[PDB]
Coordinates of C-alpha atoms and ligand atoms in Angstrom, one line a residue:
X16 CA 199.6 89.2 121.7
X17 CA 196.3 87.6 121.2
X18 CA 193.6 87.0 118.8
X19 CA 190.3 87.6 119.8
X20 CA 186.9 87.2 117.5
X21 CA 184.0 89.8 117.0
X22 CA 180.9 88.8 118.1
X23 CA 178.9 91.8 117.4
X24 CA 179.0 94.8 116.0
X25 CA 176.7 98.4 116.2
X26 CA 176.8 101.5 113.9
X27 CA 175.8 104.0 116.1
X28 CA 177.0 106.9 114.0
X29 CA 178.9 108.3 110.9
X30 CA 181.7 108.4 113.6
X31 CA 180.9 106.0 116.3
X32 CA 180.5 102.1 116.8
X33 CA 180.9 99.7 119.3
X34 CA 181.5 95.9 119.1
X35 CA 181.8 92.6 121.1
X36 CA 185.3 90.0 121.4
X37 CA 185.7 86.6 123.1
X38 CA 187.5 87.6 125.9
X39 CA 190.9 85.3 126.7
X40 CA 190.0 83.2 129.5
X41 CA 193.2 84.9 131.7
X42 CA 192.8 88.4 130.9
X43 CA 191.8 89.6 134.1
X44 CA 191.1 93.5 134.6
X45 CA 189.6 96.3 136.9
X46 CA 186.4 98.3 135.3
X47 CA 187.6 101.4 134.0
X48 CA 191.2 99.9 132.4
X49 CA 192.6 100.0 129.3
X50 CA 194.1 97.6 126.9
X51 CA 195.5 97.8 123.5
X52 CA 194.1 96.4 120.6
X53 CA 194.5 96.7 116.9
X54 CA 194.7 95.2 113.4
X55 CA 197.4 94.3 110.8
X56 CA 198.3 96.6 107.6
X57 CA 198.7 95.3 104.8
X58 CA 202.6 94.1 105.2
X59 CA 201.6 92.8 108.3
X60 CA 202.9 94.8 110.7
X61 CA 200.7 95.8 114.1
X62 CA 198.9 99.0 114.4
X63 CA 197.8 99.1 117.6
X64 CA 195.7 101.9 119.8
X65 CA 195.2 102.1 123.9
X66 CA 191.2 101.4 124.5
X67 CA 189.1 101.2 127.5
X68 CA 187.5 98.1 128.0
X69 CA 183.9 99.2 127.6
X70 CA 182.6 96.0 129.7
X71 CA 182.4 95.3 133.4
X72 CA 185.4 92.6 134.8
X73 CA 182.7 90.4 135.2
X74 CA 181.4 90.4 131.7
X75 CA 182.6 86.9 129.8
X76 CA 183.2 89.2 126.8
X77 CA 184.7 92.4 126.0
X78 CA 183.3 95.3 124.5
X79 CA 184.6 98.4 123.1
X80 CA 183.2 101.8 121.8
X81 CA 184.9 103.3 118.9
X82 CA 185.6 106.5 117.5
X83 CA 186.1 106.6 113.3
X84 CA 189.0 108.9 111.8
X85 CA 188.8 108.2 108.0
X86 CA 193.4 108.3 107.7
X87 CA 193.1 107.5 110.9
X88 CA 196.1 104.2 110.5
X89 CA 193.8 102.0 112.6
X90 CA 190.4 103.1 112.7
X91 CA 190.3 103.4 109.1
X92 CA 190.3 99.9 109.3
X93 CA 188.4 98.8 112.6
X94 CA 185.6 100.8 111.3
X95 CA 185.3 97.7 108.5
X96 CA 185.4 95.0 111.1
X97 CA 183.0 92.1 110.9
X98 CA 181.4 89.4 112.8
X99 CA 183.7 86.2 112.9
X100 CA 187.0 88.8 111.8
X101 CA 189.4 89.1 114.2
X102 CA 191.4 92.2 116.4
X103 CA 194.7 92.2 118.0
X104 CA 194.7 92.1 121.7
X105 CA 197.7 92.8 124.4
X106 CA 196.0 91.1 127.5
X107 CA 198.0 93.3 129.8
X108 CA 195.1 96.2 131.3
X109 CA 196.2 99.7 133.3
X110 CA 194.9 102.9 133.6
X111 CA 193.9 105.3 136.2
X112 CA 190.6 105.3 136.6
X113 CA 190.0 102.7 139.0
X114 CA 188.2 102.6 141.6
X115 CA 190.8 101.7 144.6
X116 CA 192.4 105.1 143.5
X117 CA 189.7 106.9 145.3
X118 CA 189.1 107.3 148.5
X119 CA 185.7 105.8 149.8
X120 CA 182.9 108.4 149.9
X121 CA 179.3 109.0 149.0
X122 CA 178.8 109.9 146.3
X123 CA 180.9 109.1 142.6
X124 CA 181.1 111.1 139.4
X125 CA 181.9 109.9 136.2
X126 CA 182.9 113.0 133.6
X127 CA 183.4 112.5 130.4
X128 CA 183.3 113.8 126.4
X129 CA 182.8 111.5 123.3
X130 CA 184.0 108.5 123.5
X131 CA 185.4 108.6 127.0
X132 CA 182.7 107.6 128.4
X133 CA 183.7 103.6 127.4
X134 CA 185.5 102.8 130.5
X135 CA 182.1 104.4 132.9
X136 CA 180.1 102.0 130.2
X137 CA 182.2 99.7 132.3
X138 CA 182.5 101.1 135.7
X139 CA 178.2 101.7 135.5
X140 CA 178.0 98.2 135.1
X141 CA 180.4 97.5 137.7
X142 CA 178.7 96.2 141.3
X143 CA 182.3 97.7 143.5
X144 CA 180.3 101.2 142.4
X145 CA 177.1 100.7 143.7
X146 CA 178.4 99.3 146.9
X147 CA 181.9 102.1 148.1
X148 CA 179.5 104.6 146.8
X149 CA 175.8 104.9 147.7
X150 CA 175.2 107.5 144.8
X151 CA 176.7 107.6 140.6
X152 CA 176.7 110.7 138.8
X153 CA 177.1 110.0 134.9
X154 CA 177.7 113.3 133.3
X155 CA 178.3 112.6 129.6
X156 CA 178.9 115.7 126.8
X157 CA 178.5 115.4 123.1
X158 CA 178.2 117.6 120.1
X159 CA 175.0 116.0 118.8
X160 CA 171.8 113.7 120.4
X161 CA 173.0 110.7 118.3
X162 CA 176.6 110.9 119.9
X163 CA 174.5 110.4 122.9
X164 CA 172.5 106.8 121.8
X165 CA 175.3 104.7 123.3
X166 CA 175.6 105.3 126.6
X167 CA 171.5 105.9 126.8
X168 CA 171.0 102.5 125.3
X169 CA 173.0 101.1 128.2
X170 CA 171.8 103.2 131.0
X171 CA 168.5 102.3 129.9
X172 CA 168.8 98.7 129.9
X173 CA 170.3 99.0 133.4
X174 CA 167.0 100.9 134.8
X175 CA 165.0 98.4 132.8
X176 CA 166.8 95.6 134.3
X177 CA 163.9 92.9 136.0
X178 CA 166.1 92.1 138.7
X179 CA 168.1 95.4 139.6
X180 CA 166.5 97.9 137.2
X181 CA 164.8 99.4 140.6
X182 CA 168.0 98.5 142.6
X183 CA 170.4 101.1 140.2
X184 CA 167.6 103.3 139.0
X185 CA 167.8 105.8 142.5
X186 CA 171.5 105.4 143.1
X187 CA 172.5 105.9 139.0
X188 CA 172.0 109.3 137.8
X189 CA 172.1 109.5 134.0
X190 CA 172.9 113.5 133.3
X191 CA 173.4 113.5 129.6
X192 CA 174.4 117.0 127.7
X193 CA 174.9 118.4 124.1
X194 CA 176.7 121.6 123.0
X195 CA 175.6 121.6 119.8
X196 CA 172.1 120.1 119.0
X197 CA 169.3 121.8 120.7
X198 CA 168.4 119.3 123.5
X199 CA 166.6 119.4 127.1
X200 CA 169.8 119.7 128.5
X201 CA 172.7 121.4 127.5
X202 CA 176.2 123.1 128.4
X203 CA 179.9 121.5 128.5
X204 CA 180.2 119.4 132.2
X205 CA 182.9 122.1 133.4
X206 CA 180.1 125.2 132.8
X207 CA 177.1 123.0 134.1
X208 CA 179.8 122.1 137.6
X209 CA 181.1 125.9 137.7
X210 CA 177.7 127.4 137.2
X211 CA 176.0 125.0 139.9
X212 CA 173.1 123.9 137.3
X213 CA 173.8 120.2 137.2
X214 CA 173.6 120.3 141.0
X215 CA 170.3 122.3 140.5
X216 CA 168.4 120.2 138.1
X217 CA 169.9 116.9 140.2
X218 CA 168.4 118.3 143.0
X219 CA 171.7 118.0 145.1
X220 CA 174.2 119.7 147.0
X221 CA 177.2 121.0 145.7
X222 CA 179.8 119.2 145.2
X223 CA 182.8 118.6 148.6
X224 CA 185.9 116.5 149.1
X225 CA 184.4 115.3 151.9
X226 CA 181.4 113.3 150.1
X227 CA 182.3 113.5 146.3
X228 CA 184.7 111.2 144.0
X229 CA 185.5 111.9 140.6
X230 CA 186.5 110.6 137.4
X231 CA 187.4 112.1 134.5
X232 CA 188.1 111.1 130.8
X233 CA 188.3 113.4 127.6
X234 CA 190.9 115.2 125.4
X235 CA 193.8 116.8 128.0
X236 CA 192.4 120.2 127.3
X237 CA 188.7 119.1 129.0
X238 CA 190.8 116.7 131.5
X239 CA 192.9 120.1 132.6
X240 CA 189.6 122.9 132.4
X241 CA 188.1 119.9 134.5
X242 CA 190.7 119.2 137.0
X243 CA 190.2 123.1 137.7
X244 CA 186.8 123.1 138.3
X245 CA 187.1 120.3 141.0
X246 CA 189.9 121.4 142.4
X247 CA 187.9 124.7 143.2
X248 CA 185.1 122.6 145.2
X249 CA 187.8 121.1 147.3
X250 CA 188.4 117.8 145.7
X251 CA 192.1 116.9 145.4
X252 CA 194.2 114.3 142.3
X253 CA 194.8 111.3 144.1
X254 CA 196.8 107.9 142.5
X255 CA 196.7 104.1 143.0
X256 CA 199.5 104.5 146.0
X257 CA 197.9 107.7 147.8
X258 CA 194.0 107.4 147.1
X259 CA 192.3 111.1 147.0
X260 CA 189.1 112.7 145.4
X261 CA 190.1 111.9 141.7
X262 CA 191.5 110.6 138.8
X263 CA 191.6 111.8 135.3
X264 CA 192.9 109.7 131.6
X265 CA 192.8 110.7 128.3
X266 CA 190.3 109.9 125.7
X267 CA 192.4 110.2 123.1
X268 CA 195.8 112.0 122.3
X269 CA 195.8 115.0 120.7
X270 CA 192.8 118.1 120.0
X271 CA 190.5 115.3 118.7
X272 CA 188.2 115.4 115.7
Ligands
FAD301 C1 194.3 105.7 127.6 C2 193.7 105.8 126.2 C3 192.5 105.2 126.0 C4 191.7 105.3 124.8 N1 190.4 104.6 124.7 C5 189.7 104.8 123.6 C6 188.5 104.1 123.5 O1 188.0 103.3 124.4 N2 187.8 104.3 122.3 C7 188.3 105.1 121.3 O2 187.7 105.2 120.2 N3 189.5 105.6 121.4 C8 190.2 105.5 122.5 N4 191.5 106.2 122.6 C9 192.1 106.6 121.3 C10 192.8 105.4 120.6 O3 194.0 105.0 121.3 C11 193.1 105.7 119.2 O4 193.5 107.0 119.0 C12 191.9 105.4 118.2 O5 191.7 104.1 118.0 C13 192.0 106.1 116.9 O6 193.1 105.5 116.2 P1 193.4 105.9 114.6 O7 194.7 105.1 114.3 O8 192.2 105.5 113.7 O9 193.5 107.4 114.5 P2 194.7 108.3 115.3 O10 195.9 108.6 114.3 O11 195.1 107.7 116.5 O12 194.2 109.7 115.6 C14 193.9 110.7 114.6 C15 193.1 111.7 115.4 O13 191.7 111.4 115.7 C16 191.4 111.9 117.0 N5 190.9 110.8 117.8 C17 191.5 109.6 118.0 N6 190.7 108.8 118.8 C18 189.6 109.6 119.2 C19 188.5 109.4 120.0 N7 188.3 108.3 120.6 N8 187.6 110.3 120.1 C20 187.7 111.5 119.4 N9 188.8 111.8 118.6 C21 189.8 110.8 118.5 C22 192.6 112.7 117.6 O14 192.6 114.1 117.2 C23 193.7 112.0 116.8 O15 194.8 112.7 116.7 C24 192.2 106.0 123.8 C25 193.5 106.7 124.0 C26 194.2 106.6 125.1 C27 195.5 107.4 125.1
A2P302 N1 188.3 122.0 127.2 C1 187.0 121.6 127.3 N2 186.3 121.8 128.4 C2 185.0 121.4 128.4 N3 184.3 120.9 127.4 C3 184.9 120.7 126.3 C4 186.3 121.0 126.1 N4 186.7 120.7 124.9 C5 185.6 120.2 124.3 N5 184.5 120.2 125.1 C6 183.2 119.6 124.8 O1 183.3 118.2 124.9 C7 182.5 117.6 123.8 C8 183.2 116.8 122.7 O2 184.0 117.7 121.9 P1 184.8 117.2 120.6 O3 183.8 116.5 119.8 O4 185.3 118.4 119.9 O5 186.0 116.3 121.2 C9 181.7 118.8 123.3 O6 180.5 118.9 124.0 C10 182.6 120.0 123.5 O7 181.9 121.2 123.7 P2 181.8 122.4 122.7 O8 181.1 121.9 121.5 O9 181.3 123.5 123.4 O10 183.3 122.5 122.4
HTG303 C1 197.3 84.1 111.5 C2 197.0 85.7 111.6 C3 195.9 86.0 112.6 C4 195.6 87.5 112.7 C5 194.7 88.0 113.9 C6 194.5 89.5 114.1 C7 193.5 90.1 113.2 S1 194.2 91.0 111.8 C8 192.9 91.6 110.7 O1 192.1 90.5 110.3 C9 191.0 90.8 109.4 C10 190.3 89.4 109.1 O2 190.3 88.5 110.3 C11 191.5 91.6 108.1 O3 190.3 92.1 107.4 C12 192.3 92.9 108.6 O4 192.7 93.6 107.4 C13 193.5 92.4 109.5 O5 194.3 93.5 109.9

């Protein structure tokens, strides 16, 4: 198990924060994996948590975004973490949500709730995407508008991008959603899919096996209401050994704060 170093940290919430680690110089990963990671207690035992890696595999360091459970054994903790301290890293990535366990198609979705959206943070930034798939669909669902300042920080600073900020802007489609908080666009990602209104204000067609690829990643009860949903437009579970329409992980274990 390895030791890696914070380099950064961000606050985004009373819940929410993401930070930056020296990445071991073998770790080697697919966008979209997980790893675990954790801290010590105070006898010094392990407490360690599954966490997508929030970066692309090309990114020199690793990033994470993290959710805050106050008795929560190791986020109690993590949410404390400094620049220059240290986390507790198994160097050994897996996961379903890659992208060689989807057939190739035209156009990708990326569904998630909270903090599931980390390993898209990775797969968005992830060049395999823009180039098996000629369009991205990121359909991310919060409570509130602040849960949200995460993943629009980084979609923005991939459409502001001098080099490719034109190149992704066009083929990334940012579709961001509250429940909660009054905002310009609203509704849980299996109503706006059922109802046809995120294919409506996209300006798209529906969604069919034959062009669409999905992801999924929330608490099993959205993973299983979602899995419905696509399953009703055609699409079909695939795996890393026979590649279909999608794939699904959860965000977390359990109902989920
Ligand atoms: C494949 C996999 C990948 C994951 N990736 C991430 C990730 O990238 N970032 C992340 O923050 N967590 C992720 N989780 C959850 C993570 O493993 C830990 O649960 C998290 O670090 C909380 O640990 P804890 O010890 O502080 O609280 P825990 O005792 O683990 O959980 C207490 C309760 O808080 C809730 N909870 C835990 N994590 C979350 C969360 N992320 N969002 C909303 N509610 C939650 C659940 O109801 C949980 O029962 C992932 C889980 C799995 C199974
Ligand atoms: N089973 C589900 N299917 C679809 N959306 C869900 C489901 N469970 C929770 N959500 C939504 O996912 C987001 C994160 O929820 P949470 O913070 O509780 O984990 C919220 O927008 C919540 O919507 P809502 O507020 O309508 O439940
Ligand atoms: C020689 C032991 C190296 C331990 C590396 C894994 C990080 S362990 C982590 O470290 C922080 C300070 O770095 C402490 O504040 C925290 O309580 C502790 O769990």
């Amino acid at each position: 198990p390895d030791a890696q170093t914070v380099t950064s940290v961000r606050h985004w919430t009373d819940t929410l924060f993401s930070f930056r680690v020296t990445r071991p110089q073998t770790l080697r990963f697919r966008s979209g994996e997980f790893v675990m990671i954790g801290l010590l207690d105070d006898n010094g035992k392990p407490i360690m948590r599954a966490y997508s890696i929030a970066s692309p595999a090309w990114d020199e360091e690793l990033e994470f975004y993290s959710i805050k459970v106050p008795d929560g054994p190791l986020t109690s903790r993590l949410q404390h973490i400094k620049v220059g301290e240290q986390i507790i890293l198994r160097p050994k990535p897996v996961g379903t949500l890659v992208i060689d366990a989807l057939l190739p198609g035209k156009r990708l979705w990326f569904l998630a709730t909270g903090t599931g959206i980390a390993p898209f943070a990775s797969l968005m930034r992830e060049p395999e995407a823009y180039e098996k798939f000629d369009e991205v669909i990121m359909m991310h669902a919060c409570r509130t508008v602040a849960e949200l300042e995460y993943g629009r920080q980084l979609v923005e600073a991939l459409q502001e991008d001098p080099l490719i900020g034109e190149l992704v802007e066009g083929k990334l489609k940012y579709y961001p959603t509250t429940t909660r908080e009054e905002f310009h666009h609203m509704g849980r990602i299996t109503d706006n899919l059922a109802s046809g209104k995120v294919f409506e204000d996209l300006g798209i067609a529906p969604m069919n096996p034959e062009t669409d690829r999905a992801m999924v990643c929330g608490s099993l009860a959205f993973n299983v209401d979602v899995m419905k949903v696509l399953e009703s437009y055609g699409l079909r579970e695939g795996a890393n050994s026979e590649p279909r329409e999608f794939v699904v992980e959860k965000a977390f274990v359990g109902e989920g704060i």
